[PDB]
Amino acid sequence: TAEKAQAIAAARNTFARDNPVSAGHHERARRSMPGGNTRSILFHRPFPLVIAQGTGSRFQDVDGHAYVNFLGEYTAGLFGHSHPVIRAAVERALAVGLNLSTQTENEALFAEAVCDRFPSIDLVRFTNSGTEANLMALATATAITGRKTVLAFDGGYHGGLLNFASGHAPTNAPYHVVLGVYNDVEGTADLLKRHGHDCAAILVEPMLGAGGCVPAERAFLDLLRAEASRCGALLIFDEVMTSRLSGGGAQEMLGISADLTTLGKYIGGGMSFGAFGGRRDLMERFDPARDGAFAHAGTFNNNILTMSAGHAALTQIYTRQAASDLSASGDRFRANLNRIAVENQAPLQFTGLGSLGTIHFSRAPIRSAGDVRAADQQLKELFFFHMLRKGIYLAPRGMYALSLEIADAGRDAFAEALADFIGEQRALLM
Amino acid sequence: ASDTAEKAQAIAAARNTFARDNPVSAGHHERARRSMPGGNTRSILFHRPFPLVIAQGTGSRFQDVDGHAYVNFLGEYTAGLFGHSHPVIRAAVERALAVGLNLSTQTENEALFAEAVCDRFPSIDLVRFTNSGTEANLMALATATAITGRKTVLAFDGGYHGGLLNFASGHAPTNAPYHVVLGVYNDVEGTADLLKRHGHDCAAILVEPMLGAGGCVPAERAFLDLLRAEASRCGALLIFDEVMTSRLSGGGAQEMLGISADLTTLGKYIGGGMSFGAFGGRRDLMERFDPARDGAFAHAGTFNNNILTMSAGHAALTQIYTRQAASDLSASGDRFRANLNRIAVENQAPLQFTGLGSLGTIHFSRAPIRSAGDVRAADQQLKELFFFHMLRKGIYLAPRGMYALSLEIADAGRDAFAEALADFIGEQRALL
Ligand SMILES: Cc1ncc(COP(=O)(O)O)c(CNOCC(=O)O)c1O
Ligand SMILES: Cc1ncc(COP(=O)(O)O)c(CNOCC(=O)O)c1O
């Protein structure tokens, strides 16, 4: 509607008036990077906030405004901006030496911690991102099976070269990808009958992350596990986001085992990180001593900062117990946010699991990419600008990912700001 | 050359001595195998019987877990330009920690780093950062195919563009399934034929100005002129993979050559030894990523703008490895390589070092090294024996015989390398 469009025009202008120093930064950034941007998700209109500095769960922008960071680096930033244990791991790495050009002890210790944590990961390899992890998992599936077809899901996001958030992106690596509808048992069974013979892999998030914190239904994942086994395709669970949900990620909570699992985000302690692991027999194809071994180099794969900060992250900070506690805290938080919507007759909900959640302006079921897209997009943008005015930073698309540094005062301020949105924007919520 | 029983027995003895010299590294390997395939997470680090595990490093030197010291002539496969403990890198890390980690937003540091990259590289008008050279090359291919609507990519046998674009031994079954045609590196007539056949459907020509992993094999002028002309004529994007070669002068191989690519990929040392890659090039091509554009190309990536890379990278380009420092290091490397080849020639040894500036690789052949075929024809057994010999002399270089001079390599190290080469030639005269 026109009414909402005008509300957004007003909110954008208010943001621009609040943030003229960020505005100047944007005009300069446009000289060296396309649209002043090097990570597409950071861009929003009229321009993005530039931040100056942060400590713990808080940061300040270049205009001086302070915020609680509920975004947490799209789930990588589990430790806040200045964790002393992470800092210590960085100091220990610098003492060991940088760019050591050789095999290290720390990479093996980190690997042991990873294999110990995740119940379907017998052996693991590190990459430099979730994008690389997923690409290597597809390389594995395709090379082993000799097949070309990959089943993935509309709304699915698996990195820079495997972006299905708005269907097929023209920039995707040219794997022969067939897209199903997330959570659609009937349609997906049909696609598997059609393509099962030629399917190298099923690639799926146990909860759409970038696609809107949409949990996978049990019946959907059971279909995928059964059919992958029947047709000889590798089931790949992309847990780059979902691994945080318990000590052993979504697979532990589900009792469903993927053939390969990809990891990313928080696991390297906030340093560059990705990983792919899985069944021993599949991963041994990368043993470089073995006959016709697959090649997987990568300059920074075993870099000392990631290996050292990650080992600290898993063993000292985000233990199995910390994962259970944060996820339970996240469940209570999301229920409280939904109670606020319910008690105020608000046409919104928050979907997700554990410490992950996203607002959707609909009271209908949010089960697939279609549902997320059909929910009100103008109200979502308005909500972002409102939260900023309340000193709460979350994703433009309405996602939060609670760090370990988020405390009672932070959660309370978020919940109060949500109530304020509902009251202040009542006219637009009818 | 062909394998012989004589050389095999020499190699088996060198491996046995290495195993005996390094029992702690051997135990590490056995443990590592329990959690990573063959105890490995980066294929290039593995060699038989097992790799050395190092304990610590300072400057240009390091020590392994059995207590041996070496000077590091490998330099992290060209990423380790600053040594193991550069004070300016360390200061950049400290500044980064003080700003804040994982800040979840844009910072100024990324714009300042992007400006330093654009200042530095003469054909890069706009740039985007990735987390590796592998990602940089994939995004450059993504850009070319999406802009052109075409499927075919011309690359070269012996070429290496990252984990999903490995042509070092021809087509790898793990490669991302771009429709890649492989040419012979430096083959003008053969490549002209391929471009005649495929040119109309060519999204991109992807080429290193010098084969890196493929053997430090310089591209010849006539070869690159052909690629530049035919890319323009066909409407293909010429992509120069300068992940390794960018170091060779202030403005990489493109400044040396006076040839401009449509896109250039970057990696290795530019992020100050932190995770890093980048792709950039012509303004009109890179603007397709402006997120304010309708139909903007998407390119997220959790760590693309991470504070450690942004901060150490800006320091690397503006404070440490300036354009003059690049010229100076390349001149130092050119004199080094010439000295090594002089030592070969004077002893009438069947070996040469190929490369440019501070990068070089030994090849056990008297033939011109111009393509992957030439590299593969050279004696591979002697290359293995060379590796173990150099280790015994306290010199660490790649198993495949590559050195990449860091800023921390001084006269003593270069002298020791040259002396160790002479000792190899003398001690292994029978097999040469
Ligand atoms: C499920 C999933 N798989 C894979 C990925 C890809 O991981 P990475 O961005 O480390 O390549 C991501 C997240 N990518 O986030 C982009 C950003 O924050 O800029 C992801 O959420
Ligand atoms: C010319 C070129 N392009 C691209 C690449 C790929 O760059 P990256 O390893 O950062 O993905 C590399 C080197 N990759 O080195 C492997 C390793 O040291 O483990 C490269 O040399």
Short mmCIF file of N, CA and C in Angstrom, two decimals, chain B residues 144-201:
data_model
loop_
_atom_site.label_atom_id
_atom_site.label_comp_id
_atom_site.label_asym_id
_atom_site.label_seq_id
_atom_site.Cartn_x
_atom_site.Cartn_y
_atom_site.Cartn_z
N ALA B 144 31.76 -13.55 -15.27
CA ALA B 144 31.91 -13.71 -16.73
C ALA B 144 30.75 -14.46 -17.37
N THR B 145 30.36 -15.60 -16.78
CA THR B 145 29.25 -16.38 -17.32
C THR B 145 27.92 -15.62 -17.21
N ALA B 146 27.70 -14.97 -16.07
CA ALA B 146 26.46 -14.24 -15.86
C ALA B 146 26.36 -12.99 -16.74
N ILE B 147 27.48 -12.31 -16.96
CA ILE B 147 27.49 -11.13 -17.81
C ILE B 147 27.33 -11.53 -19.28
N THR B 148 28.08 -12.54 -19.72
CA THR B 148 28.07 -12.94 -21.14
C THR B 148 26.91 -13.84 -21.58
N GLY B 149 26.32 -14.58 -20.63
CA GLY B 149 25.31 -15.61 -20.93
C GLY B 149 25.89 -16.88 -21.52
N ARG B 150 27.22 -16.97 -21.55
CA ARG B 150 27.93 -18.05 -22.23
C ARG B 150 28.43 -19.07 -21.21
N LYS B 151 28.74 -20.28 -21.70
CA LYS B 151 29.10 -21.41 -20.82
C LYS B 151 30.58 -21.81 -20.85
N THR B 152 31.26 -21.58 -21.98
CA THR B 152 32.63 -22.13 -22.16
C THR B 152 33.71 -21.26 -21.52
N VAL B 153 34.66 -21.92 -20.86
CA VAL B 153 35.81 -21.25 -20.25
C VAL B 153 37.06 -21.88 -20.82
N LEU B 154 37.97 -21.03 -21.31
CA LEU B 154 39.27 -21.50 -21.74
C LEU B 154 40.24 -21.33 -20.59
N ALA B 155 40.87 -22.42 -20.18
CA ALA B 155 41.97 -22.34 -19.21
C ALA B 155 43.08 -23.21 -19.73
N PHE B 156 44.13 -23.40 -18.93
CA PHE B 156 45.32 -24.11 -19.39
C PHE B 156 45.75 -25.26 -18.51
N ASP B 157 46.14 -26.36 -19.18
CA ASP B 157 46.74 -27.52 -18.55
C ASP B 157 47.98 -27.09 -17.74
N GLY B 158 48.07 -27.54 -16.49
CA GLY B 158 49.10 -27.04 -15.56
C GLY B 158 48.59 -25.87 -14.71
N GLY B 159 47.47 -25.29 -15.12
CA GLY B 159 46.87 -24.14 -14.42
C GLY B 159 46.25 -24.54 -13.10
N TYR B 160 46.34 -23.65 -12.12
CA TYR B 160 45.77 -23.90 -10.81
C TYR B 160 45.12 -22.61 -10.30
N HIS B 161 43.81 -22.68 -10.05
CA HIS B 161 42.99 -21.51 -9.67
C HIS B 161 42.17 -21.78 -8.39
N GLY B 162 42.59 -22.78 -7.62
CA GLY B 162 42.00 -23.03 -6.31
C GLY B 162 41.37 -24.42 -6.27
N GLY B 163 40.78 -24.75 -5.13
CA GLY B 163 40.25 -26.06 -4.85
C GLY B 163 39.18 -26.60 -5.80
N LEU B 164 38.40 -25.71 -6.41
CA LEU B 164 37.32 -26.10 -7.30
C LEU B 164 37.71 -25.84 -8.76
N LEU B 165 38.94 -25.36 -8.98
CA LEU B 165 39.45 -25.05 -10.34
C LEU B 165 40.91 -25.47 -10.50
N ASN B 166 41.13 -26.77 -10.36
CA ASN B 166 42.46 -27.36 -10.32
C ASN B 166 42.73 -28.05 -11.65
N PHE B 167 43.65 -27.50 -12.45
CA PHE B 167 44.00 -28.12 -13.74
C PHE B 167 45.48 -28.52 -13.78
N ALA B 168 46.10 -28.56 -12.60
CA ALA B 168 47.53 -28.88 -12.47
C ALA B 168 47.88 -30.23 -13.13
N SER B 169 46.97 -31.20 -13.04
CA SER B 169 47.14 -32.51 -13.69
C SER B 169 45.98 -32.78 -14.65
N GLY B 170 45.55 -31.73 -15.37
CA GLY B 170 44.38 -31.84 -16.24
C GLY B 170 43.06 -31.73 -15.49
N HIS B 171 41.98 -32.23 -16.09
CA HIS B 171 40.67 -32.12 -15.45
C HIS B 171 40.61 -32.94 -14.16
N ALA B 172 40.28 -32.29 -13.05
CA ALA B 172 40.10 -32.99 -11.78
C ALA B 172 38.61 -33.31 -11.63
N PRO B 173 38.29 -34.55 -11.19
CA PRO B 173 36.90 -34.97 -11.02
C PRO B 173 36.13 -34.11 -10.00
N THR B 174 36.86 -33.45 -9.10
CA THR B 174 36.26 -32.58 -8.09
C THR B 174 36.00 -31.14 -8.56
N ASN B 175 36.45 -30.80 -9.76
CA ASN B 175 36.26 -29.42 -10.23
C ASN B 175 34.80 -29.05 -10.33
N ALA B 176 34.48 -27.81 -9.93
CA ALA B 176 33.18 -27.21 -10.24
C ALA B 176 32.91 -27.37 -11.74
N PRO B 177 31.67 -27.75 -12.13
CA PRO B 177 31.41 -28.21 -13.52
C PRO B 177 31.21 -27.09 -14.54
N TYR B 178 32.13 -26.13 -14.55
CA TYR B 178 32.19 -25.18 -15.65
C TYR B 178 32.60 -25.97 -16.88
N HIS B 179 32.10 -25.55 -18.04
CA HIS B 179 32.45 -26.22 -19.29
C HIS B 179 33.82 -25.72 -19.75
N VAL B 180 34.86 -26.35 -19.21
CA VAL B 180 36.22 -25.87 -19.39
C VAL B 180 36.93 -26.60 -20.53
N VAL B 181 37.48 -25.82 -21.46
CA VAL B 181 38.38 -26.36 -22.46
C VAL B 181 39.81 -26.07 -22.03
N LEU B 182 40.69 -27.09 -22.01
CA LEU B 182 42.09 -26.87 -21.63
C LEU B 182 43.02 -26.73 -22.81
N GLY B 183 43.76 -25.63 -22.84
CA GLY B 183 44.83 -25.43 -23.80
C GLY B 183 46.18 -25.79 -23.21
N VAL B 184 47.20 -25.69 -24.06
CA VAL B 184 48.57 -25.87 -23.62
C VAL B 184 49.13 -24.48 -23.34
N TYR B 185 49.70 -24.32 -22.15
CA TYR B 185 50.29 -23.07 -21.73
C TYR B 185 51.40 -22.69 -22.70
N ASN B 186 51.38 -21.42 -23.14
CA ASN B 186 52.40 -20.84 -24.04
C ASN B 186 52.36 -21.34 -25.49
N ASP B 187 51.32 -22.09 -25.83
CA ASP B 187 51.16 -22.62 -27.18
C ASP B 187 50.32 -21.68 -28.04
N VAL B 188 50.97 -20.82 -28.81
CA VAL B 188 50.25 -19.84 -29.62
C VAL B 188 49.32 -20.49 -30.67
N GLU B 189 49.88 -21.33 -31.54
CA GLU B 189 49.09 -21.92 -32.65
C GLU B 189 47.95 -22.80 -32.15
N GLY B 190 48.27 -23.74 -31.27
CA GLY B 190 47.26 -24.58 -30.63
C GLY B 190 46.14 -23.79 -29.95
N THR B 191 46.51 -22.78 -29.16
CA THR B 191 45.49 -21.93 -28.50
C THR B 191 44.65 -21.13 -29.51
N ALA B 192 45.29 -20.60 -30.55
CA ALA B 192 44.56 -19.88 -31.61
C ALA B 192 43.51 -20.77 -32.27
N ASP B 193 43.88 -22.03 -32.55
CA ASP B 193 42.94 -23.07 -33.02
C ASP B 193 41.74 -23.27 -32.07
N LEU B 194 42.03 -23.45 -30.78
CA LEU B 194 40.96 -23.63 -29.78
C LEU B 194 40.01 -22.44 -29.76
N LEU B 195 40.57 -21.23 -29.81
CA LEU B 195 39.76 -20.01 -29.84
C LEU B 195 38.93 -19.87 -31.13
N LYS B 196 39.48 -20.37 -32.24
CA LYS B 196 38.73 -20.45 -33.50
C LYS B 196 37.49 -21.34 -33.34
N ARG B 197 37.68 -22.50 -32.71
CA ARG B 197 36.60 -23.47 -32.48
C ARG B 197 35.56 -23.04 -31.44
N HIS B 198 36.02 -22.46 -30.33
CA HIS B 198 35.16 -22.27 -29.14
C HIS B 198 34.85 -20.80 -28.83
N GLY B 199 35.62 -19.90 -29.44
CA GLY B 199 35.56 -18.46 -29.15
C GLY B 199 34.20 -17.80 -29.06
N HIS B 200 33.30 -18.13 -29.98
CA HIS B 200 31.92 -17.63 -29.98
C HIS B 200 31.14 -17.96 -28.69
N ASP B 201 31.52 -19.04 -28.01
CA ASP B 201 30.83 -19.50 -26.78
C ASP B 201 31.67 -19.29 -25.50
#
